[PDB]
């Protein structure tokens, strides 16, 4: 179906400690495949997925050069942003950056992304047309005007429509069996008394890929938003994912609840119930 490539950048100023930190990770779908950390011994882009290790030395050397320059550019961006917001030279601040492409089943660009957050809030983003920018506040409008004059959106559109899709297609061919692969979750319901009158039912989905899943509790056939606790999908640590959904029910009424599970790897949607 649909596939995506994404790069995630974090630059953190630490004026009281010395140099800022720059970290980059790259993902294809939900699979991390590269990383760079300015805080390593000698910083280098490194493989994080088995299908990328076949790239030759020119790949890692070229990309390492890019991250080192990105780290330098970001340090100056952080100094500019500190001026725009009239912020104290004393404290630590964060610039996050997130760009990449989504392609359709035929490999055609569905959407490109290129957006920034400063201190955890939206700052500026390339619009869906890849020709204009949305600025989140007056400070971001300084960047917007500067980047309009620089023709900055045309440079990024060209990467998003050209090389981004082209590298994505190549990664998808290089890592086809797994990058592609669709692994269904193994599922089960647990039951844990909270008190004499209430119990928790927990629906588990374990070991699935990709990370997209729906896990819902239905009481008498109607779903229980407002009362279902739903933890973030969490990594198993082996490139698969886990998720559970919990509902507090009156003891004696457990069997009025069903957990509905839909995942790409499941031949048919699953309806699961507590089984004593």
């Amino acid at each position: 179906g649909s596939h995506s490539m994404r790069y995630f950048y974090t630059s953190v100023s630490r004026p009281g400690r010395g140099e800022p930190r720059f970290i980059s990770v790259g993902y294809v779908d939900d699979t991390q495949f590269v990383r760079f950390d300015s805080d390593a011994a000698s910083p280098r882009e490194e493989p994080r997925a088995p299908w990328i290790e076949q790239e030759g030395p020119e790949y890692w050397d070229r990309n390492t050069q890019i991250y080192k320059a990105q780290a330098q550019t970001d340090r100056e961006s952080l100094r500019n942003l500190r001026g725009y917001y009239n912020q104290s030279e004393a404290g630590s601040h964060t610039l996050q950056s997130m760009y990449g492409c989504d392609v359709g089943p035929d490999g055609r660009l569905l959407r490109g992304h290129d957006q920034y957050a400063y201190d955890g809030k939206d700052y500026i983003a390339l619009n869906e047309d890849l020709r204009s920018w949305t600025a989140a506040d007056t400070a971001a409008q300084i960047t917007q005007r500067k980047w309009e004059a620089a023709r900055e959106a045309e440079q990024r559109r060209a990467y998003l429509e050209g090389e981004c899709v082209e590298w994505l297609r190549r990664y998808l061919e290089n890592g086809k069996d797994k990058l592609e692969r669709a692994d269904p979750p193994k599922t089960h319901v647990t039951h844990h008394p909270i008190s004499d009158h209430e119990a928790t039912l927990r629906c588990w989905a374990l070991g699935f890929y990709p990370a997209e899943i729906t896990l819902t509790w239905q009481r008498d056939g109607e779903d229980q938003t407002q009362d279902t606790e739903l933890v973030e999908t969490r990594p198993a640590g082996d490139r698969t994912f886990q998720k559970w959904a919990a509902v507090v029910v009156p003891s004696g009424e457990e069997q009025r609840y069903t957990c509905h599970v839909q995942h790409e790897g499941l031949p048919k949607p699953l309806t699961l119930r507590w089984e004593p």
Binding site: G26, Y59, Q70, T73, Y123, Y159, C164
Partner: peptide, 9 residues
């Protein structure tokens, strides 16, 4: 492969 975003914010 990443794209360098050279021009400052």
């Amino acid at each position: 492969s990443p794209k360098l975003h050279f021009y400052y914010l």
